[PDB]
Design a protein around this ligand. Structure first.
Ligand SMILES: COC(=O)CNc1nc(Nc2ccc(F)c(F)c2)nc2c1cnn2C
Ligand code: MET
Length: 530
């Protein structure tokens, strides 16, 4: 009576100094796809996102607009929740670091790290940037000019003003975890993807680590941060607070009235540790080195997999309102599912993808309409499927059996890619089979069979429709509205859409009614390039 661990995947929790943009939408889509695939696989799933709400920069922003920090972060937090509703994401849980359960948990974790002997009182001497919430070395700082045009120092990474600090702070003995980290990496060859970002991280740890500041003075962050337990002069640094959101989520019990309590430990909810943490390549180091070290100190199971991804450009340039890239607009223009497909198909996680209307139309026209939408039309066409039902197959030929084999072989390939995870190659493998299905319909010419060989027609349509069901089931994670549109048109019963029992050829009963497409209804239609 042992249960499988719940599938648990996370987005980063996002800063609330800006409205949701393409970066947050891409990270959340990746996680939404993984979650949806593991529900299609019939597993228990818990995927989470949320907002990173503490620190000086938020306090100064809430002052500027004369509302309380809590009021400012509630409002920006609500914009993230609204964006993720508009994008048709299925997040199980949306965390805020202002949540009392989270703020208590970070203090409990602080006490665990201290009780282990991993915290000491030291002193930072060097540069800090409120706007980056980051400590900087001398080689990452340069001359610039402040709001008043006075010569000053600036971040080479962000352009922001660099306040110099000579200040006591609590510290974490990261230097002590070098060997424990190298052995985690060595015993877990897939703990980081892509595999090369893993080699680069191993080398960073081999060069040795410095100890981390994990506090700032309460005055610095205007009391908008979690107090250090037992030393109210200091507040817990925003990154330590933020990283432990994933653990808070793993412990979070949500009653049917929406009230949230934390379990005492992770075992009963059976989510921890994460199957996948999804992050932008800029926060990879924090999740690959610092985060496991904190978890080692806290004696918690370590993450299974860290997945990093790139940043989108627009029109080979570099996104700037002055091109702009509003994914909510591009979804109104082309269709939400066509945009989700493009973002998951066009680039791998190693690369910085480039959006252009030209490449968007090439994939919508050439793959979604030409391959998938046209195959659906062919299967539910009244002139081809006269009875509007799944026919009885007759004897399969060698040709028929070659295709059935590729249908049975598809789940292994697609499951392997979704679990890697490599969503781009899952999609390529599904579309290889959708292209095969169109060639198979063409080769068999049902337009002839319908007035010549009813029995052979029954075979060709049964195989094609089963093929289409299998491919569509594996597209539900990426294009959930269009996938449902296809399953409804085909008359695939609800129970046949999800679960590993549906991963093989020959599920749907001959005599099942197809619903078809209504008169003006095309699943994907080619468009012009403007
Ligand atoms: C944001 O990252 C940085 O600023 C990197 N460099 C540094 N980070 C930190 N602490 C830190 C960073 C990330 C965390 F997840 C966290 F819990 C703590 N202390 C630093 C430097 C450089 N000297 N000292 C003393
Ligand atoms: C625990 S993930 C924190 C991520 C951070 N808010 C960022 O956007 O870079």
């Amino acid at each position: 009576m042992k249960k499988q661990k719940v599938f648990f995947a996370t987005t980063p929790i996002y800063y609330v100094n800006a409205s949701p943009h393409i970066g947050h939408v891409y990270s959340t889509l990746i996680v939404d796809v993984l979650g949806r695939y593991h529900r299609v696989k019939g597993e228990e799933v818990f995927v989470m996102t949320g907002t990173d709400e503490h620190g000086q920069k938020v306090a100064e922003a809430a002052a500027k607009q004369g509302v309380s920090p809590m009021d400012f972060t509630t409002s920006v937090s609500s914009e993230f929740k609204q964006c993720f509703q508009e994008m048709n994401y299925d997040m199980n849980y949306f965390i805020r670091t202002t949540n009392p359960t989270h703020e208590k948990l970070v203090q409990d974790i602080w006490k665990k790290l201290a009780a282990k002997g991993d915290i000491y009182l030291g002193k930072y001497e060097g540069w800090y940037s409120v706007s980056d919430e980051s400590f900087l070395t001398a080689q990452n700082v340069a001359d610039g000019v402040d709001r008043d045009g006075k010569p000053c120092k600036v971040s080479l990474e962000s352009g922001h003003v660099v306040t110099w600090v000579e200040e006591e702070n609590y510290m974490f003995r990261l230097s002590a975890f070098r060997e424990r980290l190298l052995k985690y990496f060595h015993d877990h060859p897939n703990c980081i993807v892509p595999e090369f970002r893993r080699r680069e991280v191993i080398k960073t740890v081999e060069k040795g680590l410095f100890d981390l500041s994990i506090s700032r003075k309460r005055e610095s962050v205007m009391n908008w941060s979690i107090p250090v337990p037992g030393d109210e002069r200091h507040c817990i640094y925003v990154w330590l607070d933020a990283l432990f959101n994933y653990y808070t989520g793993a412990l979070t019990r949500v009653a049917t009235d929406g009230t949230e309590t934390l379990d005492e430990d992770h075992h009963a909810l059976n989510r921890w540790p994460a199957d996948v943490h999804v992050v932008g390549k800029d926060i990879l180091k924090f999740h690959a080195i610092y985060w496991p070290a904190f978890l080692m100190s806290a004696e918690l199971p370590l993450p299974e997999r860290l997945v990093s991804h790139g940043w989108w450009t627009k029109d080979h340039k570099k996104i700037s309102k002055s091109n702009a890239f509003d994914p909510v607009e591009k979804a109104k223009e082309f269709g939400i599912d066509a945009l989700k497909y493009f973002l998951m198909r066009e680039s791998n996680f190693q690369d910085d993808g480039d959006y252009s209307d030209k490449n968007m139309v090439a994939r919508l026209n050439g793959e979604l309409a030409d391959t998938l939408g046209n195959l659906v039309s062919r299967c539910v066409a009244p002139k081809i499927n006269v009875n509007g039902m799944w026919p009885e197959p007759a004897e399969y030929s060698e040709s028929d059996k070659t295709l059935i084999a590729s249908l049975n072989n598809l789940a292994g390939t697609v499951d392997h890619y979704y679990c890697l995870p490599d969503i781009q190659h899952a999609l390529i493998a599904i579309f290889d089979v959708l292209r095969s299905l169109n060639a198979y319909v063409t080769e068999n010419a049902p337009w002839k069979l319908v007035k010549m060989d009813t029995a052979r027609l029954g075979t060709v349509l049964y195989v094609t429709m089963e093929g289409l069901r299998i491919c569509t089931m594996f597209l539900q994670p990426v294009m959930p509205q269009k996938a449902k549109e296809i399953m409804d048109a085909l008359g695939v019963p609800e129970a046949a859409r999800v679960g590993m029992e549906n991963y093989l050829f020959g599920i749907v009963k001959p005599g099942t009614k197809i619903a078809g497409l209504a008169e003006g209804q095309v699943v994907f239609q080619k468009v012009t390039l403007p």
